[PDB]
Design a binder for this molecule. Structure first.
Ligand SMILES: O=C(O)C1=CC(=O)[C@@H](O)[C@H](O)C1
Ligand SMILES: *[C@H]1C=C(C(=O)O)C[C@@H](O)[C@@H]1O
Ligand SMILES: [Cl-]
Lengths: 245, 247
């Protein structure tokens, strides 16, 4: 398990993560305020939708604003690489800044960033008591089950506290491939919780069936989804609770 | 896209249909259960006639079928004698079991009958023709309570049920592992997409397989079982999830 704040990830029913996507500090504040009564467990700040992402002061300022409004839930800092492109150097310093701010409980680092940069950045996070979700995505297709499994193992190998993979199905069988890889990884290789999802409405069951197949957290939407296939946070909590009985 | 209409219900379209089973031993029990279930939100009422103690008394079976139809006037009634080989409550010879089903058809009180896959091909074909003549639909079923056959073996069974005339091929299998639940889902998708010219009903049993009861709209199973109430998923919870997944 992985305990963030007072949240234990990888035990009981899967935990719910919602994404905050504001462009400006005004949007970030109004979204955070609106999310405050929503029923979720971890708040993900999707900094890649933040217009002033290349200004350090602005990012720090926006993280504080979120933290001031959402005071109990764990905060996850995520720059998902697609609108404003960044260089590897920019991406790493951004995450380092986040870690050193004290305003975030977890960071997301992409698997295909670079081994040394990743291990370096992972080390820095842990010494600052910040958890690392190491992630990989494919928004166009689903890799073979054994490849999905290889990527999750590589993330464990790099020090991830929570390996994460999100893939896009093109067939219903592709949703089953994602689940097959989840089962295989969790049962045979995982020594930490993992997060897996097959995107789109076709893959929704992968957002619901985490307790049996092995994914420890799942994303839901408050009003706008952060990825296709996310159902409302309320609907998600409803289904996880039924499945936990 | 492949559907079967039973009474006014279209099976195979929209959200999967919820089946509840009546398991009472006596006419009194049957009536009580039917009245209790009318207070629940299901689609199809299955009468598990193997539980009915007076099953070998034709008049008793006809009386009970009439009583149920008085209470549950809207919903389709499926007549199902689960054989003792399948861990039903009582033994009937093959001839008795065919006769029991022919009598359910002849009664005019049931909308569907269940016939087991390995009953006897020639008698199944005759019975299916008889049922069709009376506008009674046939669910053909097979259960593996011990294990999950390979996907292609599950597909093979479903295909044979269509070949025999089934309106709705139905299979239930027991997972021993988590991958087994996915094998049943794989067989459901392969059947629906490549070979089905009928709606199918598939299920992975036990707690571990409950996702197979929820995900039929995507994967291809036209109906699911719940309980009106410790044990399998409730009709209320099943409806809650099916509704969400239909949105
Ligand atoms: O195929 C069946 O009649 C059933 C199989 C099961 O595993 C039961 O939970 C279900 O209510 C009825
Ligand atoms: C990770 C995965 C997402 C999903 O597929 O729900 C949403 C995205 O914001 C997260 O980074
Ligand atoms: Cl059989």
């Amino acid at each position: 398990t992985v305990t963030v704040r007072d949240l234990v990830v990888g035990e009981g029913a899967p935990k719910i993560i919602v994404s905050l996507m504001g462009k400006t500090i005004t949007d970030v504040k109004s979204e955070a305020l609106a999310y405050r009564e929503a029923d979720f467990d971890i708040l993900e700040w999707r900094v890649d939708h933040f217009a002033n992402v290349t200004t350090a002061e602005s990012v720090l300022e926006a993280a504080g604003a979120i933290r001031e409004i959402i005071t109990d839930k764990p905060l996850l800092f995520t720059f998902r690489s697609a609108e404003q492109a960044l260089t590897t150097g920019q991406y790493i310093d951004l995450n380092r800044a986040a870690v050193d701010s004290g305003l975030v409980d977890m960071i997301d680092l992409e698997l295909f960033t670079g081994d040394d940069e990743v291990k370096a950045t992972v080390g820095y996070a842990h010494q600052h008591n910040v958890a690392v979700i190491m992630s990989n995505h494919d928004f166009h297709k689903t890799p073979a089950a054994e490849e999905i499994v290889q990527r999750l193992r590589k993330m464990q190998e790099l020090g991830a506290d929570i390996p994460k993979i999100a893939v896009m199905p093109q067939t219903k069988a592709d949703v089953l491939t994602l689940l097959t890889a989840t089962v295989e990884m969790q049962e045979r290789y995982a020594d930490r919780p993992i997060i897996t999802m097959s995107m789109s409405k076709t893959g929704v069951i992968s957002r619901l069936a985490g307790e049996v197949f092995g994914s420890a957290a799942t994303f839901g939407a408050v009003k706008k989804a952060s990825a296709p296939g996310q159902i409302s946070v309320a609907d998600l909590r409803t289904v996880l609770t039924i499945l936990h009985q």
